[PDB]
Amino acid sequence: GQSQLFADLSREELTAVMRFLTQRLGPGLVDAAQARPSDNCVFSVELQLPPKAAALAHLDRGSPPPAREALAIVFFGRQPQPNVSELVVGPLPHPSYMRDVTVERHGGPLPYHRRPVLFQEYLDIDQMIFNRELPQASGLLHHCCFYGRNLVTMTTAPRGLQSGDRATWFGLYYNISGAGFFLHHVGLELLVNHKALDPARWTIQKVFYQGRYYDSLAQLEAQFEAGLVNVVLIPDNGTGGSWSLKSPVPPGPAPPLQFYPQGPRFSVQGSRVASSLWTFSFGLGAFSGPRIFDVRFQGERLVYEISLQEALAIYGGNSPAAMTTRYVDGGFGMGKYTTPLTRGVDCPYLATYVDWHFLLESQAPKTIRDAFCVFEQNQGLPLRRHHSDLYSHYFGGLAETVLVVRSMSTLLNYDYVWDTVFHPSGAIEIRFYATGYISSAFLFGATGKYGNQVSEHTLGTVHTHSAHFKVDLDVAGLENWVWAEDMVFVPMAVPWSPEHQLQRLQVTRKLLEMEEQAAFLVGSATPRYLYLASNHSNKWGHPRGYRIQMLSFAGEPLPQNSSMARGFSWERYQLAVTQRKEEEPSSSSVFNQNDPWAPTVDFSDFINNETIAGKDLVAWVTAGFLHIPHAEDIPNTVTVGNGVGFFLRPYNFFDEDPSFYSADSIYFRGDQDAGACEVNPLACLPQAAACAPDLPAFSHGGFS
Amino acid sequence: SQLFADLSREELTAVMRFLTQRLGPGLVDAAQARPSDNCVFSVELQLPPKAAALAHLDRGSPPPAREALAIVFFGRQPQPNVSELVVGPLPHPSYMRDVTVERHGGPLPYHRRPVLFQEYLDIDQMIFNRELPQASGLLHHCCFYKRGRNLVTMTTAPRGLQSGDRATWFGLYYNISGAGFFLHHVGLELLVNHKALDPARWTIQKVFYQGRYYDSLAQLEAQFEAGLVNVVLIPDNGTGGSWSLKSPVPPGPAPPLQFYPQGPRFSVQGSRVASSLWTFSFGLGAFSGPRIFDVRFQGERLVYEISLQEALAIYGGNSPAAMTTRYVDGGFGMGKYTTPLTRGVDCPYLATYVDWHFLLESQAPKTIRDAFCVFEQNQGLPLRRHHSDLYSHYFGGLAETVLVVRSMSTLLNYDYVWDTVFHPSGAIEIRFYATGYISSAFLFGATGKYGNQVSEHTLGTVHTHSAHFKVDLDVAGLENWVWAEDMVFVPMAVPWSPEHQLQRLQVTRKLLEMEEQAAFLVGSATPRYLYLASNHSNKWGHPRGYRIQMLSFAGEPLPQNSSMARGFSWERYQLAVTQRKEEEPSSSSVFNQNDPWAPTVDFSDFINNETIAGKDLVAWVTAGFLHIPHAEDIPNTVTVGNGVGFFLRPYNFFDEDPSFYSADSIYFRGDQDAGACEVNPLACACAPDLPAFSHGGFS
Ligand SMILES: *[C@@H]1O[C@H](CO)[C@@H](O[C@@H]2O[C@H](CO)[C@@H](O)[C@H](O)[C@H]2NC(C)=O)[C@H](O)[C@H]1NC(C)=O
Ligand SMILES: *[C@@H]1O[C@H](CO)[C@@H](O[C@@H]2O[C@H](CO)[C@@H](O)[C@H](O)[C@H]2NC(C)=O)[C@H](O)[C@H]1NC(C)=O
Ligand SMILES: *[C@@H]1O[C@H](CO)[C@@H](O)[C@H](O)[C@H]1NC(C)=O
Ligand SMILES: *[C@@H]1O[C@H](CO)[C@@H](O)[C@H](O)[C@H]1NC(C)=O
Ligand SMILES: [Ca+2]
Ligand SMILES: [Ca+2]
Ligand SMILES: [Ca+2]
Ligand SMILES: [Ca+2]
Ligand SMILES: [Cu+2]
Ligand SMILES: [Cu+2]
Secondary structure, three states: OOOOOOOOOOHHHHHHHHHHHHHHOOOOEEOHHHOOOOOEEEEEEEEEOOOHHHHHHHHHHOOOOOOOEEEEEEEEOOOOOOEEEEEEEEOOOOOOEEEEOHHHHHOOOEEHHHOOOOHHHHHHHHHHHHHHHHHHHHHHHHHHHOOOOOEEEEOOOOOOOOOOOOEEEEEEEEOOOOOOHHHOEEEEEEEEEOOOOOHHHOEEEEEEEOOEEEOOHHHHHHHHHOOOOOOOOOOOOOOOOOOOOOOOOOOOOOOOEEEOEOEOOEEEEOOEEEEOOEEEEEEEOOOOOEEEEEEEEOOEEEEEEEEEEEEEEEEOOOOHHHHHOEEEHHHOOOOOOEOOOOEOOOEOOOOEEEEEEEEEOOOOOEEEEEEEEEEEEEEEEEEEEEEEOOOOOEEEEEEEEEEEEEEEEEEOOEEEEEEEEEOOOOOEEEEEEEEEOOOEEEOOOOOOOOEEEEEOOEEEEOEEEEEEEEEEEOOOOOEEEEEEEEEEEEEEEOOOOOOOEEEEEEEEEEEEOEHHHHOEEOOOOOOOEEEEEEEEEOOOOOEEEEEEEEEOEOOOOOOOOOOOHHHHHHHHEEEEEEEOOOOOOOOOOOOOOOOOOOOOOOHHHHOOOOEOOOEEEEEEEEEEEEEOOOHHHOOOEOOOOOOEEEEEEEEOOOOOOHHHHOOOOEEEEOOOOOOOOOOOHHHOOOOOOOOOOOOOOOOOOOOO | OOOOOOOOHHHHHHHHHHHHHHOOOOEEOOOOOOOOOEEEEEEEEEOOOHHHHHHHHHHOOOOOOOEEEEEEEEOOOOOOEEEEEEEEOOOOOOEEEEOHHHHHOOOEEHHHOOOOHHHHHHHHHHHHHHHHHHHHHHHHHHHOOOOOOOEEEEOOOOOOOOOOOOEEEEEEEEOOOOOOHHHOEEEEEEEEEOOOOOHHHOEEEEEEEOOEEEOOHHHHHHHHHOOOOOOOOOOOOOOOOOOOOOOOOOOOOOOOEEEOOOOOOEEEEOOEEEEOOEEEEEEEOOOOOEEEEEEEEOOEEEEEEEEEEEEEEEEOOOOHHHHHOEEEHHHOOOOOOEOOOOEOOOEOOOOEEEEEEEEEOOOOOEEEEEEEEEEEEEEEEEEEEEEEOOOOOEEEEEEEEEEEEEEEEEEOOEEEEEEEEEOOOOOEEEEEEEEEOOOEEEOOOOOOOOEEEEEOOEEEEOEEEEEEEEEEEOOOOOEEEEEEEEEEEEEEEOOOOOOOEEEEEEEEEEEEOEHHHHOEEOOOOOOOEEEEEEEEEOOOOOEEEEEEEEEOOOOOOOOOOOOOHHHHHHHHEEEEEEEOOOOOOOOOOOOOOOOOOOOOOOHHHOOOOOEOOOEEEEEEEEEEEEEOOOHHHOOOEOOOOOOEEEEEEEEOOOOOOHHHHOOOOEEEEOOOOOOOOOOOHHHOOOOOOOOOOOOOOOO
């Protein structure tokens, strides 16, 4: 079955679904890029992933491929009871039908306040701030901040305190040219209430300046002019790090460069990457972000899907913005906020780079150039090696080379790096880095219970990062069990001197039967060897397994006591294994960010006391850390040590190490000529086999 | 300025001629020595005292005498001792002092002494000439017996059960040609007693065949010939993996190759690496293994010393050899058992490669070619990046390049990989990988409580690996404190709507004042942020710090209840911080392997309830994992996912990211020509002309 079922929609296919929806949605249908709250609107159109039954029927058993469909989110603002609605639209490329799956999926209409804040909304909010509200305090603002074209606004987190609220705290910052404005908070923060569908009716519920609450910007300017406010002059320009990214040092000799001496050893065709060892499909959800499907090692499928589900950032702090802030980044979109990869910085210069197409908050499809990069990377390490000077004189090794796919999501200040790396041993590593700029507060007072001073007038606010992954392993077929292997010591008499005691080392295997048993809380310890496995077995008779191996420094999760916690229930777990249902496609939702108190998807609902003894299983992995900012996070947070993710590793899945059969392996005996070419491939790189290519002239995918 | 350089070949011959002429005649070469002889076991660099060394490197003083330390086996006397002697000054030695007593308070029992290469050879003459033909009937019928040329022997762990013992279990294995013999256990294990100083007197305390215990080989042969022993014939050759390393698949298009477009960006002179950012010295102890001294980031020193102290492997199993085995690898030697790096496999092809000289168990100095490699590696990752489509249109980042130093020690089956990697952010990563062959048993019976079947007739025995590192951080001078930062949530009324509650996130700092508070047991949780710091502060007024960040999947340590456990008490700790003394230079010792019950050094003695508030500190980091072998370990165990170690990371130590001032940084704005060469270095013969391949050879 040779189709590309998992490919993100092309631009024709988006135009096609747009044309279709235009014609059929009633007249009065506004473009989303200019829409007001009471308008109608196509928010999003993206690929609707196919149901698994049908997909595998095609891929494995040759049946016809399932209708390729799209899913549009529609803001219905023009009516007595405004709803959000999800509609499926197919088949592609010539759509002929549309049904409204909203009720059928979340049992009821979608409250209109759950909708993401549109780009027009943010723009209206700024008209309200800069034109109507902020000149009421123009005296204060001359005095402190060089006064509304030099200042600039930034959003927060959940918007309110209570299901249905839509009130956001907004920070104010100097509009720094050519570097991060995120460091130069001016101390002013405005709780805006924009729940109403008429922007004229929008209020400013509270105000916060340098330590103090006020009821309005008027009453702040009353108190300023009455001489009753100690105001702090915050510089406006400066130099190095806090103000720049451009290094003052001039370029020196060049760093090392990697090249393929005789052509590449893989190919990308559409959504499908293929190599001597690995074959897989890849994509970005608009909200979910990265994903790969149909991963096959030497022709056998290991995983149906691996895909980011959510990223979280829980903050604390002095100011109301920082202590309210819980970003659920799916609500903005890890795909929407993807950004071009800059060649030679984000991936190796000779990597192959791929575009990504999308239709969000517009009516034309746009394209993000160089959104993904795929490459083979020599790691420096040997994968494996042994040198025998003992009894027999030989050497046998293999340098590890690895296959890689990378996107980067720039969510305001943060640049998330998402890596999916494919080892020649049959292992799959998922990785998640955070760089970019820190979300900062204005430095004031009881600092230190809440973070570190990091520049003049700048607090680095404490926060946690957590991220969720879905790992739908299909280990040797759909029917899988989970096993927990570990270890134990048993006091025993030494057999041949019973007078003497010895501490006896033993393996421990428990087969986990129920969802509740394989759900592991953050804080609880957890089996050293945990793997999903098969009815089937390898040559020596052990169940065929793939083994999850985590890499987390997890923060304490937001306590359960909180009304908000439900919107990201998944943070509380390290790992959970679950019966994989069509009704349960995802862990979070775009709709949880703006109403986590009545969550649109609640992940703890999935762990519900069913068997996981021989069913189609799906593993859910949380990974993250705590981050007390510090001075070396200026200008940017750095990758080193901040890799988090997991390994999927073979455990009695094969009969031997597949890399035994590698084309790149190296062997020689003591009695051989190790530097003769017929014995050793490495002895010909010099003779002839050299010659770095001419390079492609540099290009860049641009900006908005 | 080369205080820390391992001894040259001249300097070894020099100490060896000096020791010859002054040790009494009757002084035998160690390679040939019998237990009752006298013997120079080792001569290696004696590291200088820290007061004096710093005096020299910082304050201009003259250098401390360059000295050597020789271990001498004094077997020819009424009470035989082992003795460590300092010998100086170099390169013209004129003195020699016996530090043994002054260091471990008394003589060194002769049984603590490492099993020499001649001892292993004598044990094999006993085994194959006197003992094994007593059972040539069984061995014809099970293992193709020829008079012992087809079989082969391998050591175990501590030797005996009790302080003073010297009785070693030995497994038998087919002598596979050109691939690891370690997978072909024949089922036979002999407890040999070799304590005596007269090899004629050596006994065979016990025997183990195929699940059952016998008192000698004669008795097993009685029981065999009586038809009373079910014998199975174990094949002798075979194909693929379990029997080979050579891939059957022909070489394909070549893998990616890294080269330096306009020459290297570092240099190696003797023991000293130098680069644009980093400057350090490097070496191997003979027993302790890798180490680096005088690490200087942009000229300021961060660490005095980082050094491997010990590697440990605890096993379990069906058979006596497996369940008795706890290898303390220092007792063999991580430096001795270092092996040449094979260019293009163990390190980048274009890396620079350095020799190592040693003098152990001989009288001439030998050399291990290509023992170290140093290289710059482009990682493919960015060190950092931001892309702004928001309010202002710009891009600013930096691909991470890294500097690396690597040695590999092959201890029998196991190939340990030791890495020291130097990030341009000011971080140092220490890494430890294990590859090579698994140590295997013969498959019989109750398997499964004890490991996995992994080939025909081969059990992969469960085991833990752990390793110990000494990290002598000198954060902004000698006086350091340690701090433990972490996090907490505090229920609080929302200020601006107090009828609602909010879970308020807060940092948590405690300054650890006592050694007991900064020693962290395996099992117990540990502060998310834990760093050594200074009196001094950065611009913003935070204490200047380096943070330790571990990477361990610890095995359960050997229980305390065990008589053996003191010989590696560092296994029970994740991390310990400690007043740094000259009487406490190391964590284990070469003498612990052969007598852990009366440990020659016991690490828990260092954690002794002193203050660590503003003292010269040292951190000790344990790292390791559990290994239940599995089919994908044949023919070798793979590196993937098996990296363990730690990061040493700036924490308010600088005023900003030093990489901000990087030469290889990249910046451009929306309104610029991103592909014009004057804006972007990335927008600009017959490249690598490669050295013809060579190899360091074998014994
Ligand atoms: C959500 O909104 C849409 C319209 O704004 C509702 O769908 C319409 O329903 C009426 C009568 O029920 C039909 O005659 C229209 O033609 C429908 N339009 C479409 C395209 O679906 C919808 O029922 C509302 N859903 C809920 C449950 O609130
Ligand atoms: C270990 O043995 C050595 C020699 O077998 C001892 O060293 C000698 O000590 C005698 C006096 O007891 C001196 O006269 C010799 O000149 C010494 N030789 C050297 C090179 O030291 C040593 O005393 C023994 N160590 C202990 C602690 O017993
Ligand atoms: C912010 O700064 C940039 C200059 O790079 C400018 O183009 C933009 O118009 C400024 N003003 C605001 C309020 O966004
Ligand atoms: C073992 O086999 C090797 C080569 O395969 C041989 O050279 C050696 O001498 C043999 N005998 C022993 C016991 O070492
Ligand atoms: Ca369920
Ligand atoms: Ca599955
Ligand atoms: Ca102490
Ligand atoms: Ca120190
Ligand atoms: Cu962060
Ligand atoms: Cu192991």
